[PDB]
């Protein structure tokens, strides 16, 4: 109405936006010009930068991460019973975009968390859908959802169990000799 307009703290990065004190904090979390953290699971990489610098950062500092071409692929997590915290990471290239496919194992019983993350903006993320499948002897568990923008992260997603979640007992129904195959399918909508 008539409050004092205090501008965004990312205005010095091109955020030509000025708003009141009551809605400043809530813009800056969902701002386009906010910096992106490293999408890799775990806190080991403390990197930060822009969306355009992410792919470079991944390619330069994370050469170990493999990229498969295809809207429909198989993500084979190997040695799934190695005790302690364990991460699996890969990327999927489809629809002119890169997606990050993560499987986390968190330790009394151990639980698996599997999620897909668009390397792009939030609004870009809403155009897509992903599907994760585990397949066994007359058994099939399937999670489907909208991929998260790396701008959001998976921390709160994983904390809210807002993804494919399953314990090690399930794992054993779908795995052969410490190998779990996750049929990942990305699609548009």
């Amino acid at each position: 109405a008539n409050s004092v307009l205090f501008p965004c703290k990312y205005a010095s990065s091109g955020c030509e936006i000025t708003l009141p004190h009551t809605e400043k904090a809530d813009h800056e979390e969902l701002c386009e010009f906010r910096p992106y953290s490293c999408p890799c699971p775990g806190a080991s990489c403390k990197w930060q930068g822009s969306l355009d610098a992410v792919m470079p950062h991944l390619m330069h500092q994370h050469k170990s991460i493999t990229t498969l071409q295809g809207e429909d692929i198989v993500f084979l997590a190997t040695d799934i019973n190695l005790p302690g915290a364990v991460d699996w990471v890969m990327m999927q290239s489809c629809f002119g975009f890169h997606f990050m496919l993560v499987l986390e194992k968190q330790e009394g019983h151990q639980q698996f968390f599997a999620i897909v993350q668009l390397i792009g903006t939030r609004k870009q993320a809403e155009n897509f859908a992903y599907r994760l499948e585990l397949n066994g002897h007359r058994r099939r568990l399937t999670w489907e959802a909208t991929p998260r923008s790396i701008h959001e992260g998976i921390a709160t997603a994983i904390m809210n169990s807002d993804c494919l979640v399953f314990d090690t007992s399930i794992a054993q129904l779908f795995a052969e000799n410490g190998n779990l195959g996750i049929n990942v399918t990305i699609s548009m909508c």
């Binding site: 493999t66 498969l68 993500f75 084979l76 302690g84 699996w88």
Partner: peptide, 11 residues
């Protein structure tokens, strides 16, 4: 079809 990536664990 479905190509297969053999991803290894990071601990």
């Amino acid at each position: 079809l479905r190509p297969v990536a053999m991803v290894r664990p990071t601990v």
